[PDB]
Amino acid sequence: EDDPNFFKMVEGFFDRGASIVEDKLVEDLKTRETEEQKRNRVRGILRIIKPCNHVLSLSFPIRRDDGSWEVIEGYRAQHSQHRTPCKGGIRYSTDVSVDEVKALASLMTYKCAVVDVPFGGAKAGVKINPKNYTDNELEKITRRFTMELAKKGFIGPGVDVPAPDMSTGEREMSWIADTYASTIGHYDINAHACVTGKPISQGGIHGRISATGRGVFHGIENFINEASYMSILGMTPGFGDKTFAVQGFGNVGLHSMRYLHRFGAKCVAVGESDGSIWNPDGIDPKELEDFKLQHGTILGFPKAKIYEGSILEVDCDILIPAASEKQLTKSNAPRVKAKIIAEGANGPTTPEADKIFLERNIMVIPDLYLNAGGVTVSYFEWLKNLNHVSYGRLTFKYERDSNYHLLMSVQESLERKFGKHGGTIPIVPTAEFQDRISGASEKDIVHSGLAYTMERSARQIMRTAMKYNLGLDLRTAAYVNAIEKVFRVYNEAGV
Amino acid sequence: EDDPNFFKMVEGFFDRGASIVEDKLVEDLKTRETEEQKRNRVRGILRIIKPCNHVLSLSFPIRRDDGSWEVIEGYRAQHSQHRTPCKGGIRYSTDVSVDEVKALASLMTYKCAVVDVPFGGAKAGVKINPKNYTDNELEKITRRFTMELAKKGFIGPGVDVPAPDMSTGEREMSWIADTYASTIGHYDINAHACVTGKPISQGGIHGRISATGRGVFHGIENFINEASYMSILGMTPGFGDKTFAVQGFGNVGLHSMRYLHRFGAKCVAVGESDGSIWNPDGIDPKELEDFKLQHGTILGFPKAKIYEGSILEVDCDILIPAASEKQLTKSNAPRVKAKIIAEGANGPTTPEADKIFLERNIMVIPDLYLNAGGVTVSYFEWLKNLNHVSYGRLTFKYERDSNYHLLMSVQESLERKFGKHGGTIPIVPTAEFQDRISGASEKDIVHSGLAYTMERSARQIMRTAMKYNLGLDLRTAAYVNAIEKVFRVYNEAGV
Amino acid sequence: EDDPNFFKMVEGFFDRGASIVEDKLVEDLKTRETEEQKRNRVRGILRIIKPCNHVLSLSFPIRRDDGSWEVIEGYRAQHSQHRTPCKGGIRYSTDVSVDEVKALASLMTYKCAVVDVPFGGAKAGVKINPKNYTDNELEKITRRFTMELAKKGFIGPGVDVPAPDMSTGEREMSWIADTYASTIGHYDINAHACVTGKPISQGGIHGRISATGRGVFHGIENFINEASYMSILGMTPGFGDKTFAVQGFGNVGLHSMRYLHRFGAKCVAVGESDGSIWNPDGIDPKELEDFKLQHGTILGFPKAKIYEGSILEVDCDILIPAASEKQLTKSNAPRVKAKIIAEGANGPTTPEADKIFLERNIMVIPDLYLNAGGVTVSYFEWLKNLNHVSYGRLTFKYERDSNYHLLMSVQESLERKFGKHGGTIPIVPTAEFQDRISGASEKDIVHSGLAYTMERSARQIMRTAMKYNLGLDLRTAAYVNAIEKVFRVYNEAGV
Ligand SMILES: NC(=O)C1=CN([C@@H]2O[C@H](COP(=O)(O)OP(=O)(O)OC[C@H]3O[C@@H](n4cnc5c(N)ncnc54)[C@H](OP(=O)(O)O)[C@@H]3O)[C@@H](O)[C@H]2O)C=CC1
Ligand SMILES: NC(=O)C1=CN([C@@H]2O[C@H](COP(=O)(O)OP(=O)(O)OC[C@H]3O[C@@H](n4cnc5c(N)ncnc54)[C@H](OP(=O)(O)O)[C@@H]3O)[C@@H](O)[C@H]2O)C=CC1
Ligand SMILES: NC(=O)C1=CN([C@@H]2O[C@H](COP(=O)(O)OP(=O)(O)OC[C@H]3O[C@@H](n4cnc5c(N)ncnc54)[C@H](OP(=O)(O)O)[C@@H]3O)[C@@H](O)[C@H]2O)C=CC1
Ligand SMILES: Nc1nc2c(ncn2[C@@H]2O[C@H](COP(=O)(O)OP(=O)(O)OP(=O)(O)O)[C@@H](O)[C@H]2O)c(=O)[nH]1
Ligand SMILES: Nc1nc2c(ncn2[C@@H]2O[C@H](COP(=O)(O)OP(=O)(O)OP(=O)(O)O)[C@@H](O)[C@H]2O)c(=O)[nH]1
Ligand SMILES: Nc1nc2c(ncn2[C@@H]2O[C@H](COP(=O)(O)OP(=O)(O)OP(=O)(O)O)[C@@H](O)[C@H]2O)c(=O)[nH]1
Ligand SMILES: Oc1c(Cl)cc(Cl)c(Cl)c1Cc1c(O)c(Cl)cc(Cl)c1Cl
Ligand SMILES: Oc1c(Cl)cc(Cl)c(Cl)c1Cc1c(O)c(Cl)cc(Cl)c1Cl
Ligand SMILES: Oc1c(Cl)cc(Cl)c(Cl)c1Cc1c(O)c(Cl)cc(Cl)c1Cl
């Protein structure tokens, strides 16, 4: 009950936001036939943006360990190409259908527009349940899948760059890169930039794994510290006195929990497919993770009870959906308790849940902004691959020396003016500037680059929510920017 | 009522035929684990054949003559690649969906297996009604469509070679070739072999337009002259005393009517979308065509009345469906009158109509054989393009001389043995051998090559219908061969 | 008269400068056969530099809006490739001939040598009068032109990178990039680096439009502030008391006027093809531009009279030719009034006008230096495209933090030495260092990079004019450096 066509579901958000700005897009336009044919031409460009450009559907055979033949299905969709290459991960699930992949792909592009990553949207899906395949079988699958994508122009450094999503980690990325760089890209100087989310030894970048969590953190942080928004929710600014619950203890889930906890937030609930756990006094990220690693499940965790009932309904301040889509529907929407909904996963709530949450006066930080930390960091990995140099190497020593001389320049100058009367005036770095004395390292850029991006995009949305009184409809605010940016292109290039 | 999903409908025919042969495919197999794991491996290979390998879905913009923006959808599916390149036409219709294109694509491959054309199956569709677009708009569409196909490996001399289908003629093929050879294939020595059904001046081959009609003729001819099959129908062999009716006065329809009429068959009905016409005394192909060209419709034709009622039900000997799919369904099936059903179009009858026709004892010459004359000739065009010489050029003079000497060798020899007593014994060619004195021409090869193929494939099917007592279930007989052939490749190819 | 072959005209400047340095190029040379065969080998290398390497001549058809067929001609020349790729704009005019394109191409390479941009010279021309073609027809032309260039290796990220010139702006560049990245470069990770001067939304860079004007400004600034040169002209250093007149109110014209005016210079005349305008009290850049945009011409401008007579002869301090070539010839040369000639356009003055201006003691700042600001900025755009990151993104936050700590390091140190006695010694940034606290942004690098380059190259020329007493023959000084740099390269290469 309340199950909408994910693709159209996203189109819904797009159209809603399209209207809001349609007027501006016509005013800025300065063409000759100034008459409202301008208004049609804008609507024409919009009708062009909405649909995917290329969608590849695969069906290929693999040989099961038991010697039998099985046909596996997979898809890869390229939504837009107003920016090259396309970006978007690969989800391994039995729920993948073209409609889903087409939707996630489109979310990737608007996602990038919000966060200013120069990539068009894309997304992949292989209809399998990894839990029923041996490691050996999976590898054969992801490798062969890379090939059939390659052969048709659906993966490449300047075409389409995959990344992780559901049930795919750096292990999968690692095989993808290897297959590509060993075959199609044997001569490509940018071969390893054909995919992101790779192991660091494979050319991955620091913190891409925890990237999304760290991003989710910044997303919330930017909003839970506004008052303008916190008042409307009857909430005190700051994390120190908040309790949250998260659906999905995975890449985006685990790390989301990790960072919030790090800033005095309390995890009162954690969920999965098998069940949810709870504890009003709070659950710890590190022991839960080790229990989960050792036992392969969160159910049974000693310092917490096996909560019976919807993880999406538990009593808390912030609800973090980090599982699959449409978890928050029209049904359960009214029974959420939480004041803040930080959309960790892509499209975890239906259009109607939004509607209800708006009325219920519960703030929903949209997915296409809140979870954009993943690509922001993937983009940094991609730049790293192109550069072929790890940040800081060429300059670590030069800056260090240069910095000590800068500091020595004020010292010797002051000793000159205040003579022997002041004796020596030692100018040493503080503990903080000491940690920076050489300049930024790879770790430093990811951390601050992400932060700069999450913060900067937050303001861009807030600023918009104001200019159009969307109040707590941040999702619409977010799409306005995406459209506003993606449009400025298609317009300025003869479509 | 009864209009199943097209793709599975064809899968239906495949499975049915799969069973019939499954046994043979296991007997011929000579592997080590001779136990019936052999039977699973065969079923495994079959599960692999059935689905399409690659399906590209396009969505791109074109600029309407009135200056507006419209998004047009198109698809191209590559069913199999056990043979390279893929082959199959492009249909321009508003009824094209992936399911349809996926179906037609699969029919192309089995079609080729029956007729022995070394191509894997493929098919394209662009969701538009050509009748609502100017010539200028169409060209923009077909050209841009060729590009988006090219960019993703869905058109190329050794990859996928398109051809005509519904609402696409040599005009469209001509633009396709031009776009390709002018861009992607500028350096390809086989650039113009990227598509068939081209204008002869564009590298087309003689008779490709009337190819399918001529083929349909041969298909019927091979069966309407067996007695073995004609007896079971209570019909005298030969065309001389037969009356037929055809649904669709198009490329496959018009020419089908043309050739049958040429051999003393009488066209009593012709149909279209607007309506059907009739005349028990027979309608003439040439005057109907000129009326149709001059007036843009068959309705109103002077030497015939405007028949009210289903063209598929009119009283005649042979019913030729040359329109779209599923015309003959479970409903109207029982009211057909005709004894012979020559499937001109692809899949014009549902699985149940078959069933009824079997019982009703009405012979149905399957589409995947009867209309294979098109690709057989397309294949000849493709070979012509690769050869870069039209049949006969290099040898016309040599054979002519060589032949006159061969004939002169018996002459001078006989004059030698019978001396002056017999005087001169002139050895001149007959009128027939004179027409061949130089050897086969492009026209000659198409005509006899087609004939050789239609006939040879007919026997292959008949021969099969006997070995498995399918009697009048020729469709199943046809699929048995297709499967039987497509199989061997995969078996010993490394699957 | 005085209408020489634009190509030889430039060759003239080259030979003249060739001689001046020939001696040095032989002295530095340290080969075995030290005898003056060295002097032949240098002359041999020079005979090799002078001519273009590849010149493509195009002739292709376009379809006029009124349905008719017209053949359009175009050329693209690649002068040198001692540096890859080639660089140089596209001029849309009816005056384009191979000789012109070959000339402008050669000016591009020496232009780059003076300014240190690692590109060999190139240039294009399409023989049409844009003023007689609709926007729709132009686009068809520029797109099809990009294709015919592509097909033959005359456009590509690492081959030949076009840019704007006469009657071509970012609109044309935008279509060029689009056609390339959508076809030939669909897989190129550097596809959008196939051309510069693109809209910013298309990957353009900040200030490339006003780049040349800004450059022209710096060019003059570096010379109008030397005294060494200002004395010889009987002129006070500085812009504050100068009046200039410019021929051509276009990309290079308008912005040239803009920047000079910004620094207290007074525009007393502005010209075009239809006519010139004047005002001894000065004309304003902003109102003239708006009049020109609204009315499509400068003639009629309220705050100025319609000057009857040559714009190249008006009374002023500095004459800025920003129109086509050979405007200042032997004829009108003696009647110029201005003391300074800032060659904005490429080769606006004939070899003899030079001669006269030398005698007349009028300083001519050579085109191949003065207007090099365009490529310098185009080069920055190209680097931007390769980098796939806009300057500053990765480091904005890190530097800002790092800087506050640097400043905090002196603060905490001083508070330590001067204890409570000095209380807090707050170390805050000035307004200027505040504007830089995060580091350079894209805007910052273009502006200072251009300045660094214009200034540095000015000194290189002055320094040379001295070592060879060319006094006011800066053109010859400029070519000496170009040759001196390019030669070295063909030298050490294996030729
Ligand atoms: N790098 C990334 O992976 C990124 C992902 N995202 C977003 O987050 C989501 C991806 O999470 P990833 O795929 O990152 O998570 P990972 O697969 O690790 O998440 C694993 C967890 O998800 C739980 N889970 C799955 N389905 C449900 C469900 N219906 N209800 C409750 N729990 C469930 C699993 O339980 P079980 O194991 O029993 O299924 C498991 O504990 C995507 O939708 C995407 O939009 C965004 C940016 C980065
Ligand atoms: N080279 C080829 O074209 C080949 C074609 N074929 C087969 O023939 C069919 C292709 O026909 P082409 O595409 O050759 O035909 P063309 O478009 O000429 O066929 C035109 C005729 O089809 C009629 N028609 C369309 N829809 C219907 C309908 N729903 N009911 C009755 N009549 C209808 C049209 O009426 P109207 O004009 O008013 O729309 C017109 O008279 C395919 O299905 C294919 O399997 C097989 C091999 C080769
Ligand atoms: N990136 C760049 O664009 C660079 C440009 N340059 C130089 O500047 C020149 C380019 O100018 P752009 O092409 O920038 O100028 P744009 O075409 O805008 O210049 C337009 C102006 O040129 C005037 N004009 C053209 N021909 C004549 C003529 N015969 N007599 C008088 N006025 C004339 C036009 O008048 P009207 O409109 O009535 O024809 C118009 O006002 C080039 O030759 C180039 O070497 C230098 C460096 C880089
Ligand atoms: N998968 C996973 N890795 C973790 C986790 N916590 C820490 N890591 C580690 O991240 C490590 C390197 O971290 P760098 O300092 O050394 O980590 P960091 O940037 O300070 O981590 P954050 O403070 O969360 O941003 C790796 O060696 C991982 O073991 C976790 O909860 N899950
Ligand atoms: N539409 C149509 N085309 C025809 C017909 N007859 C011949 N053609 C043409 O086939 C032409 C050249 O044909 P020929 O070499 O004379 O044909 P043919 O071998 O005698 O034709 P069949 O007799 O093989 O059809 C092409 O230009 C077609 O237009 C016809 O009755 N209808
Ligand atoms: N390119 C251009 N821009 C103009 C002109 N006149 C006004 N503008 C304004 O340029 C504005 C943005 O200017 P900026 O990019 O910040 O200018 P800038 O690079 O600091 O300008 P300069 O310091 O002269 O190079 C827009 O909002 C326009 O309204 C003109 O003649 N040419
Ligand atoms: O140039 C390539 C490469 Cl190296 C890989 C792929 Cl998948 C594609 Cl498609 C191309 C471009 C290309 C080709 O290289 C060839 Cl020989 C044929 C085609 Cl129809 C196309 Cl479009
Ligand atoms: O060359 C390519 C590349 Cl490298 C990518 C793509 Cl997608 C396409 Cl379509 C082409 C085909 C192509 C072209 O698009 C053009 Cl204009 C010229 C050539 Cl001689 C070639 Cl071979
Ligand atoms: O790719 C070719 C081919 Cl097949 C032939 C030639 Cl004579 C050349 Cl020199 C190339 C190099 C080349 C290319 O590799 C691409 Cl992609 C485009 C272009 Cl216009 C060109 Cl000239």
From Swiss-Prot, chains A, B, C:
SMART domains xrefs: ELFV_dehydrog
Q: Which domain of life is it from?
A: Eukaryota
Q: Name one Pfam family in it.
A: ELFV_dehydrog_N
Q: Which GO terms describe its cellular component?
A: endoplasmic reticulum; mitochondrial inner membrane; mitochondrion
Q: Where does NAD(+) bind?
A: Q81, H82, R83, D116, H192, K384
What post-translational modification does the entry describe? ADP-ribosylated by SIRT4, leading to inactivate glutamate dehydrogenase activity. Stoichiometry shows that ADP-ribosylation occurs in one subunit per catalytically active homohexamer.
Positions that bind ADP: S390, R456
- What is the E.C. number? 1.4.1.3
Per its UniProt record, what CDD domains does this chain match? NAD_bind_1_Glu_DH
Can you name one GO molecular function term for this protein? ATP binding
Q: Which UniProt keywords apply?
A: Acetylation, ADP-ribosylation, ATP-binding, Endoplasmic reticulum, GTP-binding, Hydroxylation, Mitochondrion, NADP, Nucleotide-binding, Oxidoreductase, Phosphoprotein, Transit peptide
Query: Which Gene3D superfamilies does this UniProt record tie to the protein?
Result: 1.10.287.140, Leucine Dehydrogenase, chain A, domain 1, NAD(P)-binding Rossmann-like Domain
Which residues does this entry mark as bearing ADP-ribosylcysteine?
A: C112
The Phosphoserine modification is found at S19, S68, S167, S324
Query: Which residues hold substrate?
Result: K87, K111, S378
Cell compartments where the protein resides: Mitochondrion; Endoplasmic reticulum
Quickly give the catalysed reaction. L-glutamate + NAD(+) + H2O = 2-oxoglutarate + NH4(+) + NADH + H(+); L-glutamate + NADP(+) + H2O = 2-oxoglutarate + NH4(+) + NADPH + H(+)
Q: Which residues bind GTP?
A: H206, S210, Y259, R262
User: Into which family does the record put it?
Assistant: Belongs to the Glu/Leu/Phe/Val dehydrogenases family.
| Annotated function | Mitochondrial glutamate dehydrogenase that converts L-glutamate into alpha-ketoglutarate. Plays a key role in glutamine anaplerosis by producing alpha-ketoglutarate, an important intermediate in the tricarboxylic acid cycle. Plays a role in insulin homeostasis. May be involved in learning and memory reactions by increasing the turnover of the excitatory neurotransmitter glutamate.
Q: What is this protein called?
A: Glutamate dehydrogenase 1, mitochondrial
